[PDB]
Amino acid sequence: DEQLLKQVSELLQQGEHAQALNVIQTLSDELQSRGDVKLAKADCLLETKQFELAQELLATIPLEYQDNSYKSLIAKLELHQQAAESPELKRLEQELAANPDNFELACELAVQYNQVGRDEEALELLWNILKVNLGAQDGEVKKTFMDILSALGQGNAIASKYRRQLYSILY
């Protein structure tokens, strides 16, 4: 645990959130729940755009740890989550509902979803086209699905569920 903790420390210094989250999940459960390790893990979730996991973790930080760093993380989550309901997103959404077959709008909606951490919806949007037609849009739908996954990373549980999804239906 002792050195591992400096591994986390070292990894955060360097912006390796996803490695850092990996080392975290290897600590004891006791050390995992230490309030400073929680903040660390919260910062990692947020830098990796897992805002829902971040918010639900942040909601268990006890008072004695409601730090300067915790405050700034609250404020970050609140700014991110406002940015996820834009008029822009709204319009593309109403527009895709009325043009459900326009695959090229779906790719753009998805890329905008992704830009604000609405990645579950981004990938579910695309997934719904791909499991009917892997070629959808001259393979432009599979690709934007694929850039979203790789953008996300290997630790990401949403990325991992859709990777498995897509893989299971490859010819």
UniProtKB/TrEMBL annotation:
An individual GO BP term: response to stress
Top-level taxon in the UniProt lineage: Bacteria
Name this polypeptide is given: Thioredoxin domain-containing protein
Organism whose genome encodes this protein: Vibrio parahaemolyticus serotype O3:K6 (strain RIMD 2210633)
GO CC, alphabetical: cytosol
Molecular functions per Gene Ontology: protein-disulfide reductase activity
